[PDB]
C-alpha cells in the first residue's frame, strides 16, 4: 500500500458511491447483487455496498497530484 | 465568508482556498470534534505518594497479589523475575508520563477531551461477561501490560516511514496513550476490574474500531463549520456586560 | 501651547453665517458696550467670585 | 536613579546571553545565571561618577556549530547611536572580521544610521535592538510558545512527507520580536511547539518572510 | 501599596496644596511674613545673588497629606525640577520639621544682567501639567485587589505533588502599558498579560497573539456558558496569524489576499480588478 490516504472509504466517498449505484439502478443497470424484492434504488445500492460487488474505482488526488486508485471491495465502509 | 475557503485535504492538512496550510492536522489532533469526549486522567491530580501506592503492584507481600490473581498466575509471577520486572517497568513509565502531563498543564486538571472512554466500555464489558469482583482475575499480569502496548502501536493518527512523521502521531496520541496506560494498568485491572482475558481482548478491539471511526474524514470543509459554530454562542452573549 | 494655557481657555461663540468661531468679546463689542466694564457686567452679574 | 540604571544594564546583559544561546552561540554558564550583585561589583556600582560608562559591557560569543562565526554586541553612551559611531563600530567589526554583529540602542537609532546599515547587507550585518525590550525575555513568557531552529535538510523532510510548499506553511513576519531574538535567516522555517488540550502536544512550522 | 504608589501616575498639581506669585525684590524684604523665619537662615548664605537678585518670586505650598499618599518628599522634587532647567529655575525649601511646606523659586539672574511676569506663570503652568513626578503617563490609576479565583492565585507543585494555590495581591491599571510595567522591578513578566491584542503583538510576538486569541475566544464563550470545541477556536486564531501579521476580519483585509480576480469580482471590487487582470 504505502499510501497516506486512509484505506477505509471516506464518508463523502461513501455518499457519492451510494448515489452513483442508485443512479445506475434507476437507469436500468444490471445488478451485481440481486435485489430483495426492492423497487427502491437506494435500498439496493446500500446492500450492494455491503456486498462490495459494485464495479467502481475511486481516484484520490494528493496535493502533489499523485493519484491513489481504490476498488469498492478494497475500501471499508465508514459506517 | 472569511472562513468558508478553509478545508481539510486528502492528506488531512487544513488549507485555505490559496492552499496555504492553516493546520497540519485538524484540531491539532486529526480527530473529529464530535468523537472526543471528556475523561479524567486521575494521574496528575493525586499526590505522588498516593500515585506510587496505587500503581505499586508490589509482589513482595504475595497476599494482596493472591487476592487479585488466580493461584496458578501468582506463583508463576513469583517464579519468573522477568514477569515482576515488566510490572515494575509499566509503573516507572507511568510516572514519566505523569510528569509529562504536569509539564503540559500547570493546573494539571484530570478533565481532558479524548476520543474513546475506556471506563464506560469496561463497565459495559463487566455486565456482558458477568465479571465477579469477589473472583480474582484469570488474566496474567504481563498480558495486560502487553495488550496496552499492542493497542498503542495499532492506533496511528499519522503513518510515515520517514522519521518525525511517526513522532507526530506519537504527539497526537500522547494524551490518549497516557490515559490508556493508567486505565489498563495491570495493578488497576487486577485490583478492581478483574476483567477476563477474552473481555480485555474484546475491549482492545472495540477501542481500535472506535478510534478509526474517530479520525476525521478527508475533504471536510472545517472553516465553514468553525465560523457558523462560533455564531451560536455570540447570540447568547449580552450586548452590554 | 503653554502660552495659550497660561492666558487660559478662550470662549469662542459660534454664530449663524460665520466662516470661523467669533470670540465673545468681539461679538459683544459689535452689539455695543465698547467699554471693558460694560462687557464684563453682561458676562458676570456678580464680580465677587 | 543611577543604581536602578545599573540594574537595568544587568537585565540587558542577562537577556543578551540568553539571546545568543537561542541562536546557538556558546554562552558561559555563569553569565546565564549572573546575579545583579556580581554584575554591580564586576562593572562598578553606578554609571554616573562610577566605573560603568555604557562601555566594556560588550560581549563576544563563538557559535557552537561554527567556531569562526562570532557575535559582538555594542553599547552606546548616546541614547541614539550616531551615524559616525556605527562606522567606528564597523571598523571594530572589521578588526574582528566577523559578519555577524549586534547593536543595542538606549533609545531609537537615527534613520540615517539605519540607511548606512541597509547598504552593507552582504557582510558585517548589524541587528538593531532596544535596551528597554532587553530588560525582559519574550521566550520566558507563557503566551509565547517554544521555538525550535530547523536545518534546511530538516525543513525539506516536513515538506516532502506532507507535500507542502514553503509558502503553504504559515508565515511569521520578520518585524515581530521573537523572530529577531532567534535571528532566524529569512526564508528559513522555525518549528513552533505548543501544548494542545485535545492531543496533549502539537507541532506547527513558521516561515520567516 | 508602596509599589502601587510607584506604578500610579502623580503630578505637581496633586502634591502642591496651592501655587501663588509674590513680588520680593530681596529675601530681607519679606513681603510674606511667615516665610521670613526659614528665609532668614537661607539669607545668611547668599546663593546666585552675585550676578543679580530676582524681583519676581514664585511661592509653592504643598499639602503634607498629599506628599504622604504619593510617598514624595519636597527636597527630591526641588532637585529634579532644577535638573534639566540649568540655572533658569532656583528652588529653596522649608525645614522638614516645619508644618508648612513652601518652595520659593527665583528666575535666573544671568538673563537680567519672554516677559519675566508671563515667563514665571508659563514655567509654573508647564511644570504643573507635565511634571510626571512619579508613575507611568499611560496608566492614569492603579488599583490593588486580591483574587479569589485559583487560576489568578499563584500555583506551585508541592513535594507531595498536590497543586497549591496561594493568593497574591494583583494590580489593575487603566489604559495599556505592558512594556513599561514589565520593565518596573518586582513585577512578574510571565504572569502579567495585556487585554489589547496589538500590545501582545508589539512585545510578546505573533504566536503569543495566536495563543491569547484562543484564550480570549474561550473566555468570552465560557462567560455566556456556551461550549465550543478547542479545534474551532484553534483554527480561527491559526488562519488569522497564518499571514504573520494581525489582520481584522473586514472587507479591506479580504481585499489584500492571494485569492483570484473572480473572488475579488464577487467582493464588489470587480471593475478595478478585472481591468488590472
Coordinates of C-alpha atoms in Angstrom, one line a residue, chain E residues 43-270:
Chain E
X43 CA 19.6 84.7 53.7
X44 CA 22.7 84.3 55.9
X45 CA 24.4 82.4 53.0
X46 CA 23.7 84.1 49.6
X47 CA 23.3 81.8 46.6
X48 CA 23.2 83.1 42.9
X49 CA 22.9 86.7 44.3
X50 CA 26.4 87.7 43.0
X51 CA 25.2 88.4 39.4
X52 CA 21.8 89.9 40.4
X53 CA 18.7 89.4 42.6
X54 CA 15.3 88.3 41.1
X55 CA 12.4 90.8 41.7
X56 CA 9.7 88.2 40.9
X57 CA 9.2 85.3 43.4
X58 CA 7.2 82.1 42.8
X59 CA 5.8 80.6 46.0
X60 CA 4.6 77.0 46.1
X61 CA 2.7 75.4 49.1
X62 CA 2.5 71.5 49.3
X63 CA -0.1 69.7 51.5
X64 CA 1.7 67.2 53.8
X65 CA -1.2 64.6 53.4
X66 CA -0.7 64.7 49.5
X67 CA 3.1 64.1 50.0
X68 CA 2.4 61.1 52.4
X69 CA -0.1 59.5 50.0
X70 CA 2.4 59.6 47.0
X71 CA 5.4 59.0 49.3
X72 CA 7.0 62.1 47.7
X73 CA 9.4 64.5 49.5
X74 CA 9.7 68.2 48.7
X75 CA 13.5 68.1 48.7
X76 CA 13.6 65.4 46.0
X77 CA 11.1 67.4 43.9
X78 CA 13.3 70.5 44.2
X79 CA 16.4 68.8 42.9
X80 CA 14.5 67.1 40.0
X81 CA 12.9 70.4 38.9
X82 CA 16.3 72.1 39.0
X83 CA 17.8 69.3 36.8
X84 CA 17.2 69.8 33.1
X85 CA 16.4 73.5 33.6
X86 CA 20.0 74.5 34.3
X87 CA 20.2 77.7 36.4
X88 CA 16.9 79.1 34.9
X89 CA 14.9 77.9 37.9
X90 CA 16.3 78.0 41.5
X91 CA 14.2 76.3 44.3
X92 CA 14.5 76.7 48.1
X93 CA 12.6 74.6 50.6
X94 CA 11.3 74.8 54.2
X95 CA 12.8 72.7 57.0
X96 CA 11.1 69.2 57.2
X97 CA 10.2 69.9 60.9
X98 CA 8.2 73.0 60.0
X99 CA 4.5 72.0 59.5
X100 CA 4.1 74.2 56.4
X101 CA 5.8 73.0 53.2
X102 CA 6.9 76.0 50.9
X103 CA 9.1 76.2 47.8
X104 CA 10.4 79.6 46.8
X105 CA 11.5 80.0 43.1
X106 CA 13.6 82.9 41.7
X107 CA 14.0 83.4 37.9
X108 CA 17.6 83.2 36.5
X109 CA 19.6 86.3 37.5
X110 CA 22.0 85.9 34.5
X111 CA 19.3 87.0 31.9
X112 CA 18.6 90.2 34.0
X113 CA 22.2 91.3 33.6
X114 CA 10.0 86.5 27.3
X115 CA 8.3 89.0 29.7
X116 CA 9.5 87.8 33.2
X117 CA 5.9 88.1 34.6
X118 CA 4.3 85.7 32.0
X119 CA 7.5 83.6 31.9
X120 CA 7.2 82.8 35.6
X121 CA 3.4 82.0 35.0
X122 CA 4.4 79.8 31.9
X123 CA 7.0 77.9 33.9
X124 CA 4.6 77.3 36.8
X125 CA 1.8 76.1 34.5
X126 CA 4.0 74.0 32.2
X127 CA 5.6 72.2 35.2
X128 CA 2.2 71.5 36.9
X129 CA 0.7 70.0 33.7
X130 CA 3.8 67.9 32.6
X131 CA 5.6 67.2 35.9
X132 CA 5.4 63.4 35.6
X133 CA 6.7 63.3 39.2
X134 CA 6.0 59.5 39.6
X135 CA 4.2 56.6 37.8
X136 CA 3.5 55.9 34.1
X137 CA 1.8 58.6 31.9
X138 CA -0.1 55.8 30.0
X139 CA -1.7 54.5 33.2
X140 CA -4.0 57.0 34.9
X141 CA -4.6 55.0 38.1
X142 CA -3.5 51.6 39.7
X143 CA -5.9 49.6 41.9
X144 CA -4.8 46.8 44.3
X145 CA -7.1 43.7 44.9
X146 CA -6.7 40.1 45.9
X147 CA -8.3 37.4 43.6
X148 CA -10.5 34.5 44.9
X149 CA -10.1 32.5 41.7
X150 CA -7.4 29.8 42.0
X151 CA -6.1 30.4 38.4
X152 CA -5.3 34.1 39.3
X153 CA -3.7 32.8 42.6
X154 CA 0.0 31.7 42.3
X155 CA 0.1 27.9 41.5
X156 CA 3.0 25.8 42.8
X157 CA 3.8 22.0 42.9
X158 CA 4.3 20.7 46.5
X159 CA 6.8 17.9 47.4
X160 CA 3.6 15.8 48.0
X161 CA 2.6 16.9 44.5
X162 CA -0.9 18.2 45.3
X163 CA -1.4 21.5 43.4
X164 CA -1.4 24.5 45.8
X165 CA -3.0 28.0 45.1
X166 CA -1.6 31.0 47.1
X167 CA -3.5 34.3 47.0
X168 CA -1.2 37.2 45.8
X169 CA -2.3 41.0 45.7
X170 CA -2.6 42.0 42.0
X171 CA -2.7 45.5 40.3
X172 CA -5.2 46.6 37.6
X173 CA -4.1 49.7 35.6
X174 CA -6.3 51.9 33.4
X175 CA -5.0 52.1 29.8
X176 CA -2.4 49.7 28.3
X177 CA 1.3 50.0 29.2
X178 CA 2.5 46.3 29.2
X179 CA 6.2 47.1 28.2
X180 CA 6.7 49.8 31.0
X181 CA 5.0 47.7 33.7
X182 CA 7.2 44.6 32.9
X183 CA 10.3 46.9 32.9
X184 CA 9.5 48.0 36.5
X185 CA 11.2 45.9 39.2
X186 CA 9.4 43.3 41.4
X187 CA 6.9 42.7 38.5
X188 CA 6.4 39.2 37.0
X189 CA 6.5 39.4 33.2
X190 CA 5.2 35.8 32.6
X191 CA 2.1 36.2 34.8
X192 CA 1.3 39.8 33.6
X193 CA -0.9 39.9 30.5
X194 CA -2.4 42.8 28.3
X195 CA -6.1 42.7 27.0
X196 CA -5.1 44.5 23.8
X197 CA -4.1 42.1 21.0
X198 CA -1.9 44.8 19.4
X199 CA 0.1 45.2 22.7
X200 CA 0.8 41.4 22.7
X201 CA 1.9 41.6 19.0
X202 CA 4.3 44.6 19.7
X203 CA 6.1 42.9 22.7
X204 CA 5.2 39.2 23.1
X205 CA 5.1 38.4 19.3
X206 CA 2.6 37.0 16.7
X207 CA 2.5 33.4 18.1
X208 CA 1.7 34.8 21.6
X209 CA -1.3 36.6 20.0
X210 CA -2.4 33.3 18.5
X211 CA -2.4 31.6 22.0
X212 CA -4.0 34.8 23.5
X213 CA -6.8 34.9 20.8
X214 CA -7.7 31.2 21.5
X215 CA -7.8 32.0 25.3
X216 CA -9.9 35.2 24.6
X217 CA -12.4 33.2 22.5
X218 CA -12.7 30.5 25.2
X219 CA -13.1 33.2 27.9
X220 CA -15.9 35.1 26.1
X221 CA -17.7 31.8 25.2
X222 CA -17.3 30.5 28.8
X223 CA -18.8 33.8 30.2
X224 CA -22.2 33.2 28.5
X225 CA -21.9 29.5 29.5
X226 CA -21.8 28.1 25.9
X227 CA -19.2 25.4 25.0
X228 CA -17.1 25.4 21.7
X229 CA -14.5 22.6 20.9
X230 CA -10.8 23.6 21.0
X231 CA -10.5 22.7 17.3
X232 CA -12.8 25.5 16.2
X233 CA -11.1 28.1 18.4
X234 CA -7.6 26.9 17.3
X235 CA -8.5 27.2 13.6
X236 CA -9.7 30.9 13.9
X237 CA -6.5 32.1 15.5
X238 CA -4.3 30.0 13.2
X239 CA -5.9 31.4 10.0
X240 CA -5.7 35.0 11.3
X241 CA -2.0 34.5 12.2
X242 CA -1.2 32.5 9.1
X243 CA -0.1 35.7 7.3
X244 CA 2.2 36.6 10.2
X245 CA 0.6 40.0 10.8
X246 CA -2.6 40.9 12.7
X247 CA -5.5 41.2 10.2
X248 CA -9.0 42.3 11.1
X249 CA -12.0 40.4 9.5
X250 CA -13.0 43.3 7.3
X251 CA -13.6 43.9 3.6
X252 CA -10.2 45.7 3.3
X253 CA -8.4 42.7 4.9
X254 CA -10.1 40.3 2.3
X255 CA -9.1 42.8 -0.5
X256 CA -5.4 42.2 0.3
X257 CA -5.2 38.5 -0.4
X258 CA -3.6 35.9 -2.9
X259 CA -7.2 35.0 -4.0
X260 CA -8.0 35.1 -7.7
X261 CA -9.7 38.1 -9.5
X262 CA -13.1 36.3 -9.8
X263 CA -13.2 36.1 -5.9
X264 CA -12.4 39.9 -5.9
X265 CA -15.2 40.3 -8.6
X266 CA -17.6 38.6 -6.1
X267 CA -16.4 41.1 -3.4
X268 CA -17.7 44.3 -5.2
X269 CA -14.2 45.4 -6.4
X270 CA -14.9 43.7 -9.8

